[PDB]
Amino acid sequence: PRRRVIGQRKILPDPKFGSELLAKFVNILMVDGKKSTAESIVYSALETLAQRSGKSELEAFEVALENVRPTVEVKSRRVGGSTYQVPVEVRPVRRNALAMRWIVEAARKRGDKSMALRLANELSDAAENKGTAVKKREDVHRMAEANKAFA
Amino acid sequence: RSLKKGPFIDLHLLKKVEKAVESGDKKPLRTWSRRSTIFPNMIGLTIAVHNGRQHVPVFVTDEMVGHKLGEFAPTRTYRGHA
Amino acid sequence: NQYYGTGRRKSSAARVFIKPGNGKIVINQRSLEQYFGRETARMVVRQPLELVDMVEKLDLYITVKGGGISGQAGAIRHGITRALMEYDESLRSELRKAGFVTRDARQVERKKVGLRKARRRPQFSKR
Amino acid sequence: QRIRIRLKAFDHRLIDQATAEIVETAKRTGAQVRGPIPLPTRKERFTVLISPHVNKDARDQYEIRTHLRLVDIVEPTEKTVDALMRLDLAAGVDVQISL
Amino acid sequence: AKQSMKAREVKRVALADKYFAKRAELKAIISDVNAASDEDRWNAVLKLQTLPRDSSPSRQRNRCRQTGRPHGFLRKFGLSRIKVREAAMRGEIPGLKKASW
Amino acid sequence: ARIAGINIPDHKHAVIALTSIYGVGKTRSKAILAAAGIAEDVKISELSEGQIDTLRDEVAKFVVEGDLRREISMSIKRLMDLGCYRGLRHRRGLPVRGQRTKTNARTRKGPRKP
RNA sequence: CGGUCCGGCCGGGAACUCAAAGGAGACUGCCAGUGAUAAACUGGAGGAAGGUGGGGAUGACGUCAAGUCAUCAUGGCCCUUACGACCAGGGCUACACACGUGCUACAAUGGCGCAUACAAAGAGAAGCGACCUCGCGAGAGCAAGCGGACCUCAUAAAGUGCGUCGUAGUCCGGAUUGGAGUCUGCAACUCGACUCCAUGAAGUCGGAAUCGCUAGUAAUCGUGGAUCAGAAUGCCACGGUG
Lengths: 151, 82, 127, 99, 101, 114
Ligand SMILES: [K+]
Ligand SMILES: [K+]
Ligand SMILES: [K+]
Ligand SMILES: [K+]
Ligand SMILES: [K+]
Ligand SMILES: [K+]
Ligand SMILES: [K+]
Ligand SMILES: [K+]
Ligand SMILES: [K+]
Ligand SMILES: [Mg+2]
Ligand SMILES: [Mg+2]
Ligand SMILES: [Mg+2]
Ligand SMILES: [Mg+2]
Ligand SMILES: [Mg+2]
Ligand SMILES: [Mg+2]
Ligand SMILES: [Mg+2]
Ligand SMILES: [Mg+2]
Ligand SMILES: [Mg+2]
Ligand SMILES: [Mg+2]
Ligand SMILES: [Mg+2]
Ligand SMILES: [Mg+2]
Ligand SMILES: [Mg+2]
Ligand SMILES: [Mg+2]
Known about the structure:
Strand content of chain B: 15-25%
Number of strands of chain A: 2
GO molecular function, one term (chain A): structural constituent of ribosome
Strand order of the largest sheet of chain A: 1-2
Protein name (chain A): Small ribosomal subunit protein uS7
Structural class of chain B: alpha+beta
Largest sheet of chain B: 3 strands, mixed
CATH topology of chain A: Ribosomal Protein S7
Number of helices of chain B: 1
Strand content of chain A: 5-15%
Keywords (chain A): Ribonucleoprotein, Ribosomal protein, RNA-binding, rRNA-binding, tRNA-binding
Shape of chain A: globular
Structural class of chain A: mainly alpha
Family (chain A): Belongs to the universal ribosomal protein uS7 family.
Strand order of the largest sheet of chain B: 1-2-3
Shape of chain B: globular
Oligomer: part of a larger assembly
Distance between the termini of chain B: 37 Å
Helix content of chain A: 40-55%
GO cellular component, one term (chain A): cytosol
Helix content of chain B: 10-25%
Bound molecules: potassium ion, magnesium ion
Order of helices and strands of chain B: HEEE
Number of domains of chain B: 1
CATH architecture of chain A: Orthogonal Bundle
């Protein structure tokens, strides 16, 4: 990306719901091109998030997503071999992208049986602001506030 | 393995054991036929099998039947590295 | 009379005959739920027929050859959209905005010599 | 009967002047003729190493195209048979005809 | 590629056409499953070694016709990949132009 | 519970239960349970004692335990006294079936020794 | 449309898919704006495609006394009852070790069992070899068709539905070794591939370090070809999911 600054590719909404942010979430969950396997995992996890712990299903999905989205992150800046850590505000496209990536990686390293119940626990941990996907958010927020002087 | 419709042996080895069959014990039989199978008809003979440079004598015992003659003559010498 | 369309996606090719009136879609003498097990393939063959509203207004007789699941389902959607623009011709400019009129020309890139795939290079080492 | 005629050649200009010769010899002699149709062209590929010694990834790729044409003949008269057996064809067209 | 290696090759195919494809009867007819499965099959397996160590098409190395190269052979042309390319660029092989698809 | 193979297997399904018997893989275990008339998804809890020595009766038709270990150990010592090529690869510790020893003979040679 | 044994299989049709010849189409051509009355840039319309539409072939003068006298050719030197020629057997496959490039794994987005969808591109006459019968199987017997849009290789796999396993060194992994076989071939000991039964190592995600990829790409899943009697995890190609 020196010269040709590009647009972006448009994607389909989710079939069952009409969601393009769930279509992004299934894409981030998808391994080695298996889209049909990944839609079944999300739909299984979204049901047992809705029916066991309070309804309003994708209303509950963004309640879990609001609680992991960062607002300020840190980025390197190289000057003279001492490269500062400068806090920068996060774009809202990048906000959803980082929140869904932290939730999938949190749900991957659990010890429960299925993938859908690991995902269901992580969304119910995030809806109540606990777990490890939330703690990745405040660890970024702790480091951003630590380097607040370099604004 | 070779299939069940005929074990292999050379003819010059087959005739040479035949004349050691009747005419008795000899000098060890020099052969180059490492690919021949050991028959019942060879127990008691000594076959000197070629291995590339020498002829190694093999005294045939009853458990050697159905093996190859080349199995009792190692073609590569090797003893330790360092 | 039958109004006809031809659509194609990656290696799939679909012919589409539309007939005036009811909601029967039959594909390779099977209907939609029997042919496409995947809900995503069911939706993209439905997709052109909810911008134009057809409750049970057009019988669709479609056959398809070649490709896989998503290739056949995109070849159907492109074949339907061409049949509906033959059907009344006022439909084009909103079907353009939905991107259904565009033939998707994305083909598989050929394998190249010296490369492991179309673009995948073997592992490099400095020494 | 019908007589069936297959043409194969390495060139497509040379093969369909050859079909044009045998579609027009055959109703000049007065027979309905069926076709001509193009059958699918079989292309055979080759891939060589160009260097005499090493450099595995430096290669050339070549191709031979064999074009195919089929003519069926509806009305095999006596005049039709002696017409298209004694025709002036090129050196690139192979003919094999069916009874 | 070493005049003797070609003469070994020329002698091998001429002696292979001498016996085999004519007297492959010794194994294709007698070593069969029926009443010949007695001693006559066994004498056929013995008789197959009286023929010379050649005679068999499994000792044809199938080299190039001009240089005699044992590797890089193409059965369609009979030439090695060096001589296929050198004569195709000269326009000698009919229909062989550079592929680009 | 135990079999004529006097290992004491699991309370898992019987077709995996008889695989703990040394000398019975999965094909043999399917042939035991088909000849004893008992289904494969059946554990050895729910299997009463009349159903267990119908298995011991059927398992006793193969050479299966440390009696087979003796048959295996006689097979190796015989080559190690025959002096053949397979006995030389056995009496030493190098692979027998003609694999590469320049690299990658590591399961036969043990962990590597600098 | 008629008929049907319900298979385009017959009558038939030349529409459609497709086959392969010919032609058309995209040029910043058109419309705004910016620009030095410029060349050109951003945006819009139309359009299957928009600014080199995608991919390939195509590699300037030269650099590294770079590689190849073992493809071939060739100056000089050397051998000429041998540094030439023929044959059998062995070796190139050795094995304390170190490195490069790959394949398969360490599982539950999975393993196994049953049922069931959707490809492309190829090859074939000392060849590809169906149906049927026998064998658990690799295969065998018999033998039709095909120099091929006709016959064969050849029932794609991931996928989908149901059942089971329930986080274990396991119903994960399939290395190693024992026994019994098949096929090719004069001949499978050194030193082939494959099948069956039994065996069930290491391995639970990998130190310092390091590689590839910007879209039908990466990742993953199968298929074919050349070489070739037999003998791919390599190489060259092809489509699916994405
Ligand atoms: K066992
Ligand atoms: K020279
Ligand atoms: K050898
Ligand atoms: K070896
Ligand atoms: K490999
Ligand atoms: K490696
Ligand atoms: K061998
Ligand atoms: K296991
Ligand atoms: K082969
Ligand atoms: Mg691919
Ligand atoms: Mg390479
Ligand atoms: Mg390199
Ligand atoms: Mg050979
Ligand atoms: Mg080997
Ligand atoms: Mg027409
Ligand atoms: Mg140099
Ligand atoms: Mg020799
Ligand atoms: Mg080597
Ligand atoms: Mg078959
Ligand atoms: Mg584990
Ligand atoms: Mg690029
Ligand atoms: Mg896999
Ligand atoms: Mg392959």
